[PDB]
Amino acid sequence: ECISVKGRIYSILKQIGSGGSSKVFQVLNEKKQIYAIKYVNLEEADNQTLDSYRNEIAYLNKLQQHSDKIIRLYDYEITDQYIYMVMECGNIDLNSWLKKKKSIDPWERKSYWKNMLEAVHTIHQHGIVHSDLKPANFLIVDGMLKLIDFGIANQMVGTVNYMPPEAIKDMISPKSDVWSLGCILYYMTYGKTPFQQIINQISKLHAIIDPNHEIEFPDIPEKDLQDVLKCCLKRDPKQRISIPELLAHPYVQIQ
Ligand SMILES: Nc1ncnc2c1ncn2[C@@H]1O[C@H](COP(=O)(O)OP(=O)(O)OP(=O)(O)O)[C@@H](O)[C@H]1O
Numbered sequence: 001e002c003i004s005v006k007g008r009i010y011s012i013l014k015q016i017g018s019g020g021s022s023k024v025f026q027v028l029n030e031k032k033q034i035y036a037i038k039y040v041n042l043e044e045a046d047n048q049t050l051d052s053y054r055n056e057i058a059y060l061n062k063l064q065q066h067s068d069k070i071i072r073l074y075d076y077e078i079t080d081q082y083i084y085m086v087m088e089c090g091n092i093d094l095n096s097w098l099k100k101k102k103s104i105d106p107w108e109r110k111s112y113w114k115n116m117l118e119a120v121h122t123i124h125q126h127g128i129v130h131s132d133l134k135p136a137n138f139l140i141v142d143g144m145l146k147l148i149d150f151g152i153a154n155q156m157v158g159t160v161n162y163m164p165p166e167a168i169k170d171m172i173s174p175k176s177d178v179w180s181l182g183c184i185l186y187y188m189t190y191g192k193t194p195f196q197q198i199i200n201q202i203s204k205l206h207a208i209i210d211p212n213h214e215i216e217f218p219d220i221p222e223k224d225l226q227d228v229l230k231c232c233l234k235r236d237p238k239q240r241i242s243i244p245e246l247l248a249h250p251y252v253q254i255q
Pocket residue numbers: 016017018019020022023024036071087088089090091092093139148
């Protein structure tokens with residue numbers, strides 16, 4: 001069958017994943033060019049939800065022309081009943097790709113880390129702190145990671161392995177995103193997130209906020225990489241490294 005978006009027929013190759021009231025479709029336009037179409041049903045959406053959906057559409061549309069490490073939004077159609085978003089089509093999300101891989105090319109890890117910083121840097125430059133970063137938020141598109149959401153979408157099996165200590169103690173600033181990026185890199189380096197071994201979630205959160213629970217950093221060839229991980233995973237936000245600092249770090253600069 002088909003989807004019309006702004007008077008353009010797209011044909012559905014398949015559904016990517018399988019959401020409820022939100023659905024992503026791999027599609028082709030008339031000229032057989034591939035896109036991804038996000039469909040959202042709005043009939044059960046309150047005003048606050050609608051407001052945040054529009055806000056994320058606004059920022060995604062706006063930040064596009066600043067970085068190609070943000071997913072390209074070509075067009076959208078928005079009424080009171082639904083939303084269609086025509087988007088650049090990616091191969092696979094970072095989480096799915098990591099799950100089926102024992103190791104990673106050291107060069108590729110570094111390259112992906114550059115992309116992530118560029119993307120997160122960009123949203124910071126327009127006042128947006130994501131605050132819920134995890135590998136699923138990134139999409140591989142021609143050997144590039146692209147950030148596919150900004151975490152503005154509201155009440156639309158979780159995970160707390162990427163959560164920064166200051167969010168837990170507070171019961172959040174650009175540094176919060178650095179911690180999570182730090183957990184994503186740690187994972188790509190050591191094959192597991194820092195506190196992955198703690199299956200009890202209440203304990204896990206205590207482990208994250210506990211100074212006396214020291215995070216292990218097994219020695220590796222890339223001593224720069226090791227340093228990046230230590231700097232990103234410093235519990236005190238003030239002591240934690242910023243994104244502009246990470247962009248000047250040897251790990252990302254030195255060939
Ligand atoms: N622009 C895009 N290009 C390619 N794939 C995409 C794009 N946007 C989203 N996807 C993929 O579509 C899938 C959507 O799955 P689904 O609708 O079940 O939601 P989810 O992301 O798995 O979780 P939730 O729906 O709860 O957010 C995800 O696996 C995601 O990687």
